[PDB]
């Protein structure tokens, strides 16, 4: 408001907890477009004759200096927020199941996004094995059982089961040709709390 | 550019009614130059750097800062009542401390969160459904308040598979 | 040289004393306020343990009982290894600004970091300028501040497993009464000396 | 801090038990194990007794310090412990979990048990508040965890200290 709204930033997010129907890219637009009309007096007075040296324009140089430190933290948690939690679902998923849209992609988020994806992929390379064996971390975690069967869930969509099968339509009744390889990908974002 | 927290920018606004002891110019967010002794309420960011020797403006408290209140409450430390007038009061002084030139408040400051250290006692729990003691609260006594509520909640989960 | 170490060495090291040989490394890390030292022998220990065991299984691939345990087992020392580097990993997204200060101080052998993390920290602090590419970057700035992670007085609870008496070492406070059993509380700053002697513990 | 993850720590602790196999299609795993024959005890952790008990194979049996009278004593003791008391294995509240959640199918007095434990529990808890009503001037060198156990200790650790360094400062 003078330095408030980041809090409502995040509520374009309100619902979405679990139960997500998708996301966007709310609350940069007018919000940056400040920034570019406020430079000119952050820095109008640049060692000028303005004034004549005086003491007087030290209010002036802490005002840049505090607008910049709520700008750029503000983004800092716009940043690392949106990262975080899908974080959460990037652990629960690998780029298997991407995003719900991957239409709120805030435009250079593509570097960000993908280099956290970069970070799982040196995860999996050193660890795991030192050639890397990508260790199966945080789903499918079935005790070796059958390779190809399906059975019931609880409704997701979004749809990017890319992995093995025709179509398998990832949903309740998701009942169809489904390898091991195919579903390699569900443990929670809203599907088999009930098999 | 702080400790941070989640309160990121609750930190440097907190409003103040200081007095005036020479003159200034153009004060901008309000004559390039004024009389010696003027009320005026000023926020904390500019004055934050702004030497505590160097006299434009003078010694200042606010009321419920001032020593009479603060005083007879490091005497009423067992049942200082705070409400919504005042919501934060913890780290204040973390900042405010040394304008005083009367050096009284960071003892204040540390026998009131003292006495948190007697209080809490009694917080320990989420015996039941919803909200309990949700305005007498600082909003970073509120943290580990929600922070030990949710430790009981989740070790009542354990005190059996439940 | 002194061989027969509990290394990889001409020795058998259990699947339990290889449990035991970093899980104070993982609790330690745990309750903290910072990073502490770093370990990579494990990588070719795990994987050469853990790939020994499962062609092992493999060969007996078809019982029921023995694939099983050998499998819950594996299970659980692959979830202490994810916990260990999960929260290591999220210590340095946070404590990636003053890290780099120690490490351009020295630099340090296997003691403190390890090099992917290296290549993790480099790789995020420059994206996160090139995200900020399209914030302020026709007017970025013109012209210290930005730390996390540098805190080292958050209260810790330690265990002492040393002589019953006072035995008195480095640390600023009076450090009296340690014991065998026993622990009188105190912070990290004035106490990060014993634990990389492995004298004392957290939990 | 969790319901479960002291369990990747407490239940590898060891109890000792009696299958009722021959040694199986794999005889004995590579480590600690002994053999495998039914009729006589054998030693184990505790991430198969969970497996194994409710798999229908075998029965079970605890520790010594699962009894009435010995903590029927240790209570009478604790209280005039103005510090501490009796300690058996130091993470005992975790196998009484998951010894009578499964186990009371052959194992005797198997709720009395449960009342003198909660009833250690609470007294000693009670006791590591007043801790705190004493703890005074910041001292930080200097407390209590003589014959403290840790599946308490939990149940304060995020309250207290996160806030206690950066208050308690001043002094």
Same mark, same amino acid.
């Given at each position: 408001?003078?330095?408030?709204?980041?809090?409502?930033?995040?509520?374009?997010?309100?619902?979405?907890?679990?139960?997500?129907?998708?996301?966007?890219?709310?609350?940069?637009?007018?919000?940056?477009?400040?920034?570019?009309?406020?430079?000119?007096?952050?820095?109008?007075?640049?060692?000028?004759?303005?004034?004549?040296?005086?003491?007087?324009?030290?209010?002036?140089?802490?005002?840049?200096?505090?607008?910049?430190?709520?700008?750029?933290?503000?983004?800092?948690?716009?940043?690392?927020? !949106?990262? !975080?939690?899908?974080?959460?679902?990037?652990?629960?998923?690998?780029?298997?199941?991407?995003?719900?849209?991957?239409?709120?992609?805030?435009?250079?988020?593509?570097?960000?996004?993908?280099?956290?994806?970069?970070?799982?992929?040196?995860?999996?390379?050193?660890?795991?094995?030192?050639?890397?064996?990508?260790?199966?971390?945080?789903?499918?975690?079935?005790?070796?059982?059958?390779?190809?069967?399906?059975?019931?869930?609880?409704?997701?969509?979004?749809?990017?089961?890319?992995?093995?099968?025709?179509?398998?339509?990832?949903?309740?009744?998701?009942?169809?040709?489904?390898?091991?390889?195919?579903?390699?990908?569900?443990?929670?974002?809203?599907?088999?709390?009930?098999? | 550019?702080?400790?941070?927290?989640?309160?990121?920018?609750?930190?440097?606004?907190?409003?103040?009614?200081?007095?005036?002891?020479?003159?200034?110019?153009?004060?901008?967010?309000?004559?390039?130059?004024?009389?010696?002794? $003027?009320?005026?309420?000023?926020?904390?960011?500019?004055?934050?750097?702004?030497?505590?020797?160097?006299?434009?403006?003078?010694?200042?408290?606010?009321?419920?800062?001032?020593?009479?209140?603060?005083?007879?409450?490091?005497?009423?430390?067992?049942?200082?009542?705070?409400?919504?007038?005042?919501?934060?009061?913890?780290?204040?002084?973390?900042?405010?401390?040394?304008?005083?030139?009367?050096?009284?408040?960071?003892?204040?400051?540390?026998?009131?969160?003292?006495?948190?250290?007697?209080?809490?006692?009694?917080?320990?729990?989420?015996?039941?459904?919803?909200?309990?003691?949700?305005?007498?609260?600082?909003?970073?006594?509120?943290?580990?308040?929600?922070?030990?509520? $949710?430790?009981?909640?989740?070790?009542?989960?354990?005190?059996?598979?439940? | 040289?002194?061989?027969?170490?509990?290394?990889?060495?001409?020795?058998?090291?259990?699947?339990?004393?290889?449990?035991?040989?970093?899980?104070?490394?993982?609790?330690?890390?745990?309750?903290?306020?910072?990073?502490?030292?770093?370990?990579?022998?494990?990588?070719?220990?795990?994987?050469?343990?853990?790939?020994?065991?499962?062609?092992?299984?493999?060969?007996?691939?078809?019982?029921?009982?023995?694939?099983?345990?050998?499998?819950?087992?594996?299970?659980?020392?692959?979830?202490?290894?994810?916990?260990?580097?999960?929260?290591?990993?999220?210590?340095?997204?946070?404590?990636?600004?003053?890290?780099?200060?120690?490490?351009?101080?020295?630099?340090?052998?296997?003691?403190?970091?390890?090099?992917?993390?290296?290549?993790?920290?480099?790789?995020?602090?420059?994206?996160?300028?090139?995200?900020?590419?399209?914030?302020?970057?026709?007017?970025?700035?013109?012209?210290?501040?930005?730390?996390?992670?540098?805190?080292?007085?958050?209260?810790?609870?330690?265990?002492?497993?040393?002589?019953?008496?006072?035995?008195?070492?480095?640390?600023?406070?009076?450090?009296?009464?340690?014991?065998?059993?026993?622990?009188?509380?105190?912070?990290?700053?004035?106490?990060?000396?014993?634990?990389?002697?492995?004298?004392?513990?957290?939990? | 801090?969790?319901?479960?993850?002291?369990?990747?720590?407490?239940?590898?602790?060891?109890?000792?038990?009696?299958?009722?196999?021959?040694?199986?299609?794999?005889?004995?795993?590579?480590?600690?194990?002994?053999?495998?024959?039914?009729?006589?005890?054998?030693?184990?952790?505790?991430?198969?007794?969970?497996?194994?008990?409710?798999?229908?194979?075998?029965?079970?049996?605890?520790?010594?310090?699962?009894?009435?009278?010995?903590?029927?004593?240790?209570?009478?003791?604790?209280?005039?412990?103005?510090?501490?008391?009796?300690?058996?294995?130091?993470?005992?509240?975790?196998?009484?979990?998951?010894?009578?959640?499964?186990?009371?199918?052959?194992?005797?007095?198997?709720?009395?048990?449960?009342?003198?434990?909660?009833?250690?529990?609470?007294?000693?808890?009670?006791?590591?508040?007043?801790?705190?009503?004493?703890?005074?001037?910041?001292?930080?060198?200097?407390?209590?965890?003589?014959?403290?156990?840790?599946?308490?200790?939990?149940?304060?650790?995020?309250?207290?200290?996160?806030?206690?360094?950066?208050?308690?400062?001043?002094?």
């Amino acid at each position: 408001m003078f330095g408030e709204k980041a809090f409502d930033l995040l509520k374009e997010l309100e619902r979405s907890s679990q139960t997500i129907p998708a996301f966007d890219d709310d609350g940069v637009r007018q919000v940056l477009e400040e920034i570019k009309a406020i430079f000119e007096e952050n820095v109008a007075q640049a060692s000028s004759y303005n004034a004549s040296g005086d003491r007087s324009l030290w209010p002036l140089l802490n005002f840049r200096h505090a607008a910049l430190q709520r700008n750029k933290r503000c983004l800092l948690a716009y940043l690392y927020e !949106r990262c !975080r939690r899908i974080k959460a679902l990037r652990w629960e998923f690998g780029p298997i199941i991407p995003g719900d849209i991957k239409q709120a992609l805030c435009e250079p988020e593509v570097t960000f996004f993908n280099n956290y994806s970069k970070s799982l992929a040196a995860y999996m390379c050193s660890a795991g094995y030192n050639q890397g064996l990508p260790i199966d971390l945080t789903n499918n975690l079935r005790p070796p059982k059958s390779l190809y069967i399906e059975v019931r869930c609880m409704e997701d969509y979004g749809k990017f089961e890319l992995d093995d099968g025709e179509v398998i339509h990832l949903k309740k009744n998701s009942q169809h040709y489904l390898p091991r390889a195919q579903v390699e990908s569900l443990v929670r974002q809203g599907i088999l709390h009930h098999i | 550019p702080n400790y941070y927290s989640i309160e990121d920018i609750f930190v440097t606004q907190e409003k103040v009614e200081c007095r005036v002891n020479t003159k200034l110019q153009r004060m901008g967010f309000l004559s390039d130059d004024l009389e010696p002794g $003027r009320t005026v309420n000023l926020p904390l960011w500019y004055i934050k750097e702004l030497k505590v020797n160097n006299a434009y403006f003078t010694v200042a408290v606010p009321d419920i800062y001032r020593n009479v209140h603060k005083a007879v409450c490091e005497a009423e430390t067992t049942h200082i009542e705070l409400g919504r007038l005042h919501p934060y009061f913890y780290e204040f002084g973390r900042y405010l401390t040394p304008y005083d030139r009367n050096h009284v408040i960071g003892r204040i400051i540390f026998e009131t969160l003292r006495q948190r250290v007697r209080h809490l006692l009694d917080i320990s729990k989420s015996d039941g459904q919803a909200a309990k003691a949700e305005h007498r609260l600082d909003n970073i006594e509120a943290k580990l308040h929600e922070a030990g509520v $949710r430790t009981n909640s989740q070790y009542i989960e354990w005190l059996q598979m439940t | 040289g002194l061989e027969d170490e509990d290394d990889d060495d001409m020795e058998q090291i259990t699947a339990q004393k290889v449990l035991e040989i970093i899980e104070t490394a993982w609790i330690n890390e745990m309750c903290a306020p910072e990073i502490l030292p770093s370990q990579t022998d494990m990588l070719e220990l795990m994987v050469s343990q853990v790939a020994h065991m499962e062609e092992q299984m493999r060969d007996l691939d078809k019982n029921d009982f023995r694939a099983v345990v050998h499998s819950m087992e594996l299970e659980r020392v692959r979830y202490i290894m994810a916990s260990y580097l999960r929260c290591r990993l999220q210590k340095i997204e946070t404590f990636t600004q003053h890290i780099l200060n120690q490490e351009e101080s020295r630099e340090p052998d296997d003691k403190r970091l390890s090099p992917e993390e290296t290549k993790f920290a480099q790789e995020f602090a420059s994206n996160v300028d090139e995200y900020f590419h399209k914030v302020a970057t026709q007017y970025m700035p013109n012209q210290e501040q930005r730390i996390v992670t540098p805190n080292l007085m958050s209260h810790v609870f330690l265990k002492a497993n040393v002589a019953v008496p006072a035995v008195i070492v480095g640390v600023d406070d009076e450090e009296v009464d340690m014991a065998a059993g026993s622990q009188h509380i105190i912070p990290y700053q004035l106490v990060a000396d014993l634990i990389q002697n492995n004298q004392a513990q957290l939990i | 801090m969790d319901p479960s993850i002291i369990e990747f720590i407490g239940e590898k602790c060891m109890i000792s038990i009696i299958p009722n196999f021959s040694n199986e299609p794999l005889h004995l795993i590579y480590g600690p194990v002994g053999p495998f024959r039914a009729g006589f005890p054998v030693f184990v952790p505790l991430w198969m007794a969970t497996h194994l008990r409710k798999q229908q194979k075998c029965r079970i049996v605890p520790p010594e310090w699962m009894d009435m009278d010995i903590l029927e004593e240790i209570k009478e003791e604790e209280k005039r412990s103005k510090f501490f008391t009796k300690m058996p294995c130091e993470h005992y509240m975790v196998v009484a979990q998951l010894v009578m959640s499964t186990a009371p199918d052959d194992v005797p007095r198997c709720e009395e048990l449960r009342t003198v434990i909660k009833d250690i529990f609470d007294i000693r808890e009670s006791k590591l508040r007043t801790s705190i009503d004493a703890f005074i001037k910041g001292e930080g060198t200097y407390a209590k965890l003589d014959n403290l156990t840790l599946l308490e200790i939990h149940s304060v650790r995020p309250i207290l200290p996160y806030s206690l360094d950066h208050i308690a400062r001043y002094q």
